[PDB]
Amino acid sequence: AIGPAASLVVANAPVSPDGFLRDAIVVNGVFPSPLITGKKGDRFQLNVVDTLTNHTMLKSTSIHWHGFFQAGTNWADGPAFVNQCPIASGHSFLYDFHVPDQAGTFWYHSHLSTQYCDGLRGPFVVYDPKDPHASRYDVDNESTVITLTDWYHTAARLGPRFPLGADATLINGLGRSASTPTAALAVINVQHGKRYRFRLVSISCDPNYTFSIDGHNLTVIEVDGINSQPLLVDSIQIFAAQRYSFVLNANQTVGNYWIRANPNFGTVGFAGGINSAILRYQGAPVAEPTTTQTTSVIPLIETNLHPLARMPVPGSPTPGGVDKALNLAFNFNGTNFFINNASFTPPTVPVLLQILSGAQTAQDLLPAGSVYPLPAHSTIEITLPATALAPGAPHPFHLHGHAFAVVRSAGSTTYNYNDPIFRDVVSTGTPAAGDNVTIRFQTDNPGPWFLHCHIDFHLEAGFAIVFAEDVADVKAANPVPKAWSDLCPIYDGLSEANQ
Numbered sequence: 001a002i003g004p005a006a007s008l009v010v011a012n013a014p015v016s017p018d019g020f021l022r023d024a025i026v027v028n029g030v031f032p033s034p035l036i037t038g039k040k041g042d043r044f045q046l047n048v049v050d051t052l053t054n055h056t057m058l059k060s061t062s063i064h065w066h067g068f069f070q071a072g073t074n075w076a077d078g079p080a081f082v083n084q085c086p087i088a089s090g091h092s093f094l095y096d097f098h099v100p101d102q103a104g105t106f107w108y109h110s111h112l113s114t115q116y117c118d119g120l121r122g123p124f125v126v127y128d129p130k131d132p133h134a135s136r137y138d139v140d141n142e143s144t145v146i147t148l149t150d151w152y153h154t155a156a157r158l159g160p161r162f163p164l165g166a167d168a169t170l171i172n173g174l175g176r177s178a179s180t181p182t183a184a185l186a187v188i189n190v191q192h193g194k195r196y197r198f199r200l201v202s203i204s205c206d207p208n209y210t211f212s213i214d215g216h217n218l219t220v221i222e223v224d225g226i227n228s229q230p231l232l233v234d235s236i237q238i239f240a241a242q243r244y245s246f247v248l249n250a251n252q253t254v255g256n257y258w259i260r261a262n263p264n265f266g267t268v269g270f271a272g273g274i275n276s277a278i279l280r281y282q283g284a285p286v287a288e289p290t291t292t293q294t295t296s297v298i299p300l301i302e303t304n305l306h307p308l309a310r311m312p313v314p315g316s317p318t319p320g321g322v323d324k325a326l327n328l329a330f331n332f333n334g335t336n337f338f339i340n341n342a343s344f345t346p347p348t349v350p351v352l353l354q355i356l357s358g359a360q361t362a363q364d365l366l367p368a369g370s371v372y373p374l375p376a377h378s379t380i381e382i383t384l385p386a387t388a389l390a391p392g393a394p395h396p397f398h399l400h401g402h403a404f405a406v407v408r409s410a411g412s413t414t415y416n417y418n419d420p421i422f423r424d425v426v427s428t429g430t431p432a433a434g435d436n437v438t439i440r441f442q443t444d445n446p447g448p449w450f451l452h453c454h455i456d457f458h459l460e461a462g463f464a465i466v467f468a469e470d471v472a473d474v475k476a477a478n479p480v481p482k483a484w485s486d487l488c489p490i491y492d493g494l495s496e497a498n499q
């Protein structure tokens, strides 16, 4: 682990996590990217050094620290052309921010086009010295972080615009493909009688995974960085970018158990040990498990999750009972996704720079039709109805700069204005279920923040909008460092081949 002060050297290198060699993007020489850690209250100083040389996976880069509110540091959020111009090859840029009021399981990834799928993605854990759940487990460290990665044998910009599934599922950076049946499997070691806090992170570019561990039940205690009341489950369907912490009591008979992560599409199932990993108790023989998968009888259901501390829902307990309600109508035309008739295309001047340059209204901000000003200190309700006009469902939507209350979850017709879970990535479900996912949050964080589908190939095809929150306080709330002001002039001088 590295952090909270560290340098991240981004570069290209050939990797073979599933035994197939391909050029990719590594950070500090490895893939997935290294685990970054800190404690609640720390100042994070992450120096990103861009030494990328391959234009096909892009030589420029930008990094987003997924889940952090970035209050006062909107310039360090990461989205290229929203919060900064990309960092150029041969240059570095220091992301400097604090995390005073958050703790839990997060992750970081490139936020420039589809570059994170090419390798720039890794876990990020912020420990809480006074964790309210600390008495529930014995072990919580770098060896208890589990990443789920969708891996492609063809580079993101060389493949189809909407890939039909990954070549392999990697658990802790290792897995088998259906062309590499003998590659090494990841092994997670546990000691009989100990309790482990496993921090499950989906760093997926697309598929959702149905996760389970043979012969063991799991106690969920954290959801996208938010502590939850303990919930016993035997399987977890986790969408791209979501995170869960669960307690595993290693009290079963010493042996080898399969860890399973089945994708929703692509090569499903476990033939040959694909989409799997190994849970090995100390004392067990070095061998592949022979355990069988049991039907899930207590699967995780989002409406059964509730925050550990009271988190009141903003607004009145009635539909549209808020200061500003917005319905997002999705559409797709064969190549691009649209929200309310607008497909997001990155502007030449980052939205935050537009705002600092004098742009204050919707018709002043670019791109036109995709930027929505939100009033300060108000309650907001957003509905994201599933629809057949937007293929590739269920679409996991994510909001930058905030955590939100999930008033109505996918697969449920009820509204919970009392104690719903708060989180930062939510599945919007499917039109067959008649879903109308409803979320609420308050505007307490001035700046332009992205709201988009976390399937990266869909974001690239325009499935996003920008909220320009409290436009009048943006400049004063977010003083920018000189190094950030230099990024656009540097990037704009690049020829297309060096981008």
Ligand SMILES: *[C@@H]1O[C@H](CO)[C@@H](O[C@@H]2O[C@H](CO)[C@@H](O)[C@H](O)[C@H]2NC(C)=O)[C@H](O)[C@H]1NC(C)=O
Pocket (backbone or CB within 6 Å): 022, 023, 024, 054, 055, 056, 057, 153, 154, 155, 158
């Ligand atoms: C730059 O990166 C790209 C993408 O990873 C590499 O693309 C490979 O190109 C070869 C030859 O055209 C193909 O056979 C491979 O299938 C491509 N790989 C992938 C992962 O798609 C390219 O080789 C890299 N360039 C250099 C000089 O290393």
Ligand SMILES: *[C@@H]1O[C@H](CO)[C@@H](O[C@@H]2O[C@H](CO)[C@@H](O)[C@H](O)[C@H]2NC(C)=O)[C@H](O)[C@H]1NC(C)=O
Pocket (backbone or CB within 6 Å): 215, 216, 217, 234, 297, 298
């Ligand atoms: C995982 O938890 C489930 C809870 O539903 C356990 O299943 C129940 O186990 C008790 C055994 O005392 C039975 O009486 C119930 O009928 C079970 N039934 C089902 C399918 O609901 C399961 O045993 C737990 N597994 C482990 C490995 O602890």
Ligand SMILES: *[C@@H]1O[C@H](CO)[C@@H](O[C@@H]2O[C@H](CO)[C@@H](O)[C@H](O)[C@H]2NC(C)=O)[C@H](O)[C@H]1NC(C)=O
Pocket (backbone or CB within 6 Å): 319, 320, 325, 326, 327, 383, 385, 435, 436
């Ligand atoms: C999803 O829920 C939203 C919010 O309740 C629905 O939009 C509201 O629909 C009613 C019409 O019956 C109007 O009174 C509101 O003005 C609508 N819009 C907004 C912005 O609030 C939306 O129709 C629901 N969609 C589906 C498919 O059920």
Ligand SMILES: *[C@@H]1O[C@H](CO)[C@@H](O)[C@H](O)[C@H]1NC(C)=O
Pocket (backbone or CB within 6 Å): 249, 251, 252
């Ligand atoms: C394992 O511990 C769990 C609690 O996490 C409990 O349900 C059960 O009593 C234990 N089973 C064994 C094999 O001891």
Ligand SMILES: *[C@@H]1O[C@H](CO)[C@@H](O)[C@H](O)[C@H]1NC(C)=O
Pocket (backbone or CB within 6 Å): 333, 334, 335, 336, 343
């Ligand atoms: C989809 O709309 C985008 C954005 O306007 C446009 O560039 C593209 O031509 C459209 N695609 C089709 C297949 O019509």
Ligand SMILES: *[C@@H]1O[C@H](CO)[C@@H](O)[C@H](O)[C@H]1NC(C)=O
Pocket (backbone or CB within 6 Å): 329, 340, 341
């Ligand atoms: C999108 O444009 C169509 C065609 O004019 C219009 O009928 C519809 O109201 C628009 N959708 C939204 C949500 O604005």
Ligand SMILES: [Cu+2]
Pocket (backbone or CB within 6 Å): 064, 066, 109, 241, 398, 454
């Ligand atoms: Cu993200």
Ligand SMILES: [Cu+2]
Pocket (backbone or CB within 6 Å): 064, 065, 066, 067, 398, 399, 400, 401
């Ligand atoms: Cu984010």
Ligand SMILES: [Cu+2]
Pocket (backbone or CB within 6 Å): 392, 394, 395, 396, 453, 454, 455, 458, 459, 463
């Ligand atoms: Cu999507």
Ligand SMILES: [Cu+2]
Pocket (backbone or CB within 6 Å): 064, 111, 398, 400, 450, 452
């Ligand atoms: Cu994002």
